[PDB]
Symmetry: T
Subunit: 142 residues, 12 copies
């Protein structure tokens, strides 16, 4: 606060228009609108970005580390697979909240391990799109 | 909503007055006050209970299943150990949110498995006492 | 024989009125009636008890060990989790039959390990409420 | 009911005359007599067969699937080892009960995994020869 | 080529008339017709055999090793369980293709290990009955 | 059919000119020619693409999901490592066939696990370059 | 010192009168006498309690944490199973000694893992009833 | 002694004429001649049989158990896979020696586990055809 | 020699200016200067590149394979995670040395497995920035 | 009693003068003095030896087995690694107590397995130098 | 042949006079006599040595490698634990036979892994003292 | 610097004259010459010792700890097996570099775990004899 970095990884540009049983009927742009409006009332700025590239995501983390600005991260598949991501996050001085739209713990046994959690401030899973909004509100207090 | 069952398990009566490095400087009673005030503004009732007994906790879940009222659960150690708890929760018709005050994923490798998660709606870990408050607010929307 | 201890653990007071896809449409009291009537014709006494408390169950086992009277045990979740139970049973001089209402082997991989089996006389799973009745009838022969 | 297929696998022709510490002093033929007499009073027909051949056993299962007649199976060693058996059973429309004469759970750790259980109706272990008789009686109710 | 050995293991005589959700509505004989007709146009002979016996299958492999003729193998359950089979195949001078009608990788975790694959030329799973036909056509090129 | 998406992942631009013990003496362009000619006679269009980038591959899958057009995927190393890929594929409405040029099961034990298989229609491994051609022909039937 | 909390868990009220091959011919009350007399000569007070309830034990630990008084713990089965216990102990400011009457390491492989050890001062196993007495004497020095 | 049962399992009829890198250039019949001649000088009878059928092998073991005559067993693949075999052997009153022609411990990691060893008198691996002859000579002493 | 490819992966552009407890106070550019000066005296050319992109790194390896020029690789997180990298390296005709700035073996247990090592010439870990310089000097001899 | 063999393994000659955070400020010779004085009052003889050689230690055990005299063993690293030691101890007719100066269970996960425990009378860990003294006193009773 | 190195490891000097349930009533010297007499008739020299020291054993292997003379090895505990031994043996040009007096496979699960087997010619276990004699006789043929 | 302890473990006296495929054609003495000459130019003293005894090696480490002089360690097999070594090294105040002549990571899966690495400064594997020389040069800088 004021500035709050919201980051989505691979596939998360496909929200709503594809799925929506599993990650909900809300499109990406609509999500940016949701976050931006909730940051308004909270008196925060939400810089909300999405990418299907690990190097892009990496860069955004690098920048957040530098600017010492907090992050909210939905890294998609890279959550379970990337050590490069984890280690970039590890550097962040500001809090990092890990967010999952679906409950990870009620799926394939592999989706239950996370490289991000151990170095996150805390995690939200399965509360859907609202996970982002609840994460925001946390940061506005701390 | 209106009625929201908030449940803490073993040891969680010792909040603040003991620790507070790990689970924070906020006492139990103060937590009940926090929750009760946040439920006020939200237009919910928070029935917040704590017990060091598995049979007691079981009973409270039974009642919540019956009344079809939502639960927020910080089951302490029973999270990693009790199948009896998990299965009582499994019955709940209303949403169940699993809450951890400390980040479970940044501790002993054993604290990372949960019998509750797979059948929870979703989970919050490491956001501290606020985890309860963010959980509440979820339920008020859904 | 004559005296046969029938014991149910956690959650098993909720039979029929809750579930009944998984553990059947038969309530607890109705089960006591079923057992008591089958013991009648067999010329046995069925002392059938249920508790959601490990210390209670423990006590009933202690008493059965002392009285050297047989046990039929549906320990619910404690089957997979409690070493305290297992060891109390281990003491029983009389036969112990382990009973599961649902087939344990057709569920979560964790439900397939039992602390009770290795020291039971034998086990019945998935034959539903009748498991108790078939267990009884065994004891009446041996 | 009326027709109930009782099947024993490898080595089970050696009952009583060999062992009898572990699987009891009752010979195979005597077991057929026991089952046939219990089916009499129950008003069932017991077609009780034994083979040391997987292809033979397979064939008998095939036939039972076809005739939609229930099975009681003591598959000996093939219980822990054969996927071919499991899958033939999987096809059966009628209930299948898995029977073990000795308690499997009180022996070598390997004897504790079963390919049959997950797709059985239910299982009986360690109740000795009576396991067959209790299984029968189940089927006569359902 | 010309001569191509097509071999099915346990249960695979039950094709179509039983299942057909999982392994398809095509009967065994119809499959022989399918293969024989595809070998016609390809200018190959298809010797297509099925057995529920490991010793029979073994013998057919022995003969194929001797005649140095290629094999297409759907060994059913023996795929995951038999080292005797694997080792007989290992001897084959000609290519061996492993065929599965259902996708093995989308089922029980145990169905995912194969004793045959490591010493096969290659494998086809989940393409249904056509797996055989595509395997044939391979052999006609190499 | 008509339109069939053929996709190769990392390193697969190096075909023939490098290796060729392991993945064969056929160059990439020659492979496109092979596929394009086989699609000709089949009356299909083969859109055959290769990339060493996960985001690129992701995008091509996204497009195929959208256009509801089938995919043939040789994802190279990402087969064993990427959950992001798997999940993009999971979305595809049309069949997906997983193709490996080398037999994966006859190499390092790690090359034997696949994130793609469980959600593929079926898989071809070790039939070399022809795997693509046999996959095509499948799709032309279904 | 002066005040030394001695705590036994589940089943440990059955000492001597039941067993005594495994945990010895000495009854509970006799053990209290033994400890109380050894504390006499040492110039300590031994407050020796036993319970079959986890909540009771929990409470006694809570009190010991508060009073900053040392503990000697024979938690029976809860040693291998309870994280709730472990964490209550973790809080104790004073030394905690873990005591086992039987050698845990010469039994079932499961009895060899302890949730208590990692946060104990030290452990005594297999020295029988004397383990308590040797533990006492330690505390009297430190 | 006098009578010594020598048994080979699956594939072992193919000795010499096929392989011979791995299990040696000596044919089966030649092996029978070797054994029969060594039993001559030793003053034993060697009844040497081979089968590719588990039921056949089973039967021969049954007979040996009955006649209380010793066995030398090269069970091929069934060594690593069959519990039915192991248990038939378990019954033998006379010594059983397990024989492997190739060193099992210098091959695939799976070939290193044996169901037979734990209940054998002792084992010989990798000494080639002579393993049989050395086994014989043992029995002639004991 | 003369030409030596030095490659850094993800995050390694952040050297010195960020960290420096763990990977040292030396910036990337300063590292290029260090390497370039050491190659001077050695009579080698150091082409030192860094990228946060797997496809970029892949390309540089491809080129090195082609030019048959040696590589020194600090692949960051991709060391533990990428099979695509490993396999591109596998192709290199020239020696590859794997370099880690921090000791990998004194950190998280996951950082201890490497996809690169098995196909490297050799590895240097924990000797800090000098690892690169010692690697260079190796290549100048061989 | 009278004669009590006290044995230390590798590195344990370095006590006090090196460490002393972990195994305490007490030197070896001082430990011999401590033990010798405690054996005085107890009316025992303490023959206390230390060696960094497995063959030496072996020999001392051999002698103790022969003389049927009890042992107290701090085998250092050989505790977790040597089967030769374990088996020499296994022979001892007299009690063996296993002693660890540091709590083994609060360190590296590998330090938690012991080859000695299963065949010890009992074990003391983490009670520091006093572990030896408490062990002595045990032996003086039994 | 002529010269055959027979080597025993740790504890094996204690044969007969200690045990003899497990490794037999035959003393070491008597074993040397047995071997020396059997080598006589065979026309071999048996150089039979025993040591409780790894460096000694190492040296004897070194010498055997040098002299290219065969070895028979009973390495006691070092069989399951030493890589140093294994690797010294690995060097031997002549055959190495691994000998165990007791059946290793019928004991603790840990005694079943051997560092020696994979690089032995072959192994004998459980044939008692005669294992040595049968090993000798092998070498005299090859 | 000046004084640098170079230590080789078991079998490493056999360098060059035996092997040399795997650890190179350079004899031990020649290695001492190599190291001594490289230390000359560096202005260091190399005290280079080798032993096949764990107690000897232990002693040399003890001395190095005492003298606070750096170590370079090629511990041969003890690398994967000895906790006694690891712990002696752990004490060293000066840097310790772990050196392997062969690439450990390209061999048996067991050779890939090291007790030494976690407490080393850093490690060199597979750079052959030069590993020692590069290690030296490191120490001369730090
Ligand atoms: O936020 C999550 O809970 C989540 C977790 C995962 O493991 C994903 O791969 C993941 O990413 C996907 C994967 C496939 C499709 C979509 N999508 O169509 O929004 C998103 C999201
Ligand atoms: O909410 C959590 O994050 C939490 C997680 C756990 O695994 C606990 O055992 C746990 O319970 C404890 C354990 C020990 C002490 C206290 N306390 O003094 O508040 C609470 C809490
Ligand atoms: O008898 C069984 O097969 C059984 C097995 C289990 O693992 C249970 O947790 C178990 O207990 C439950 C759990 C949840 C709900 C009920 N119930 O509503 O009867 C019973 C029963
Ligand atoms: O019914 C059982 O409990 C049972 C379980 C098993 O794992 C058997 O192998 C098994 O089969 C055997 C094995 C060896 C001997 C006999 N028999 O002499 O009856 C039967 C039976
Ligand atoms: O070809 C396969 O994909 C396949 C794989 C398996 O694991 C089988 O057990 C298997 O065999 C069965 C098993 C049960 C029933 C039938 N069938 O009724 O055709 C076939 C087939
Ligand atoms: O299609 C396969 O069977 C395959 C499987 C893999 O695991 C690959 O990494 C893989 O990709 C590579 C890896 C290295 C080199 C090449 N190439 O020079 O064609 C291709 C291909
Ligand atoms: O102190 C021990 O060594 C001990 C260890 C355990 O794992 C117990 O379950 C345990 O508790 C029991 C269990 C069953 C019976 C009795 N008892 O009759 O004293 C005590 C005691
Ligand atoms: O005696 C052995 O060492 C042995 C061990 C095995 O694991 C076999 O499968 C085995 O059986 C085979 C397998 C394939 C071929 C032959 N054969 O051509 O003699 C024999 C033999
Ligand atoms: O060279 C290494 O020892 C090393 C090993 C790793 O596992 C890395 O992730 C790794 O990459 C990182 C990760 C996070 C931050 C930095 N950095 O600020 O230089 C570099 C480097
Ligand atoms: O008694 C123990 O608790 C103990 C346990 C261990 O695992 C040791 O390696 C061990 O040995 C060491 C190891 C390193 C240094 C010393 N020392 O300087 O006394 C002693 C001692
Ligand atoms: O030859 C064997 O079968 C054998 C196997 C082992 O694992 C031993 O530790 C072993 O060594 C011992 C161990 C303890 C005692 C004796 N002994 O009194 O002859 C010998 C021997
Ligand atoms: O430095 C190494 O890379 C190395 C690694 C190991 O695991 C050894 O056992 C090892 O020791 C041996 C083993 C067998 C033979 C020799 N040698 O003839 O030099 C040396 C050396
Ligand atoms: Cl979580
Ligand atoms: Cl069961
Ligand atoms: Cl596959
Ligand atoms: Cl312990
Ligand atoms: Cl063996
Ligand atoms: Cl390394």
């Amino acid at each position: 606060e004021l500035i709050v970095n919201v980051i989505n990884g691979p596939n998360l540009g496909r929200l709503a228009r594809r799925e929506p049983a599993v990650y909900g009927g809300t499109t990406h742009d609509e999500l940016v609108a949701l976050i931006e409006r909730e940051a308004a009332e909270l008196g925060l700025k939400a810089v909300v970005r999405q990418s299907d590239s690990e190097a892009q995501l990496l860069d955004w983390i690098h920048q957040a580390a530098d600017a010492a600005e907090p992050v909210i991260l939905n890294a998609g598949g890279l959550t379970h697979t990337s050590v490069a991501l984890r280690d970039a996050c590890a550097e962040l001085s500001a809090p990092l909240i890990e967010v999952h739209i679906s409950n990870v713990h009620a799926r394939e046994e592999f989706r239950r391990h996370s490289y991000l959690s151990p170095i996150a401030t805390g995690v939200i899973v399965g509360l859907g799109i609202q996970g982002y909004l609840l994460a925001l509100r946390y940061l506005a207090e701390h």
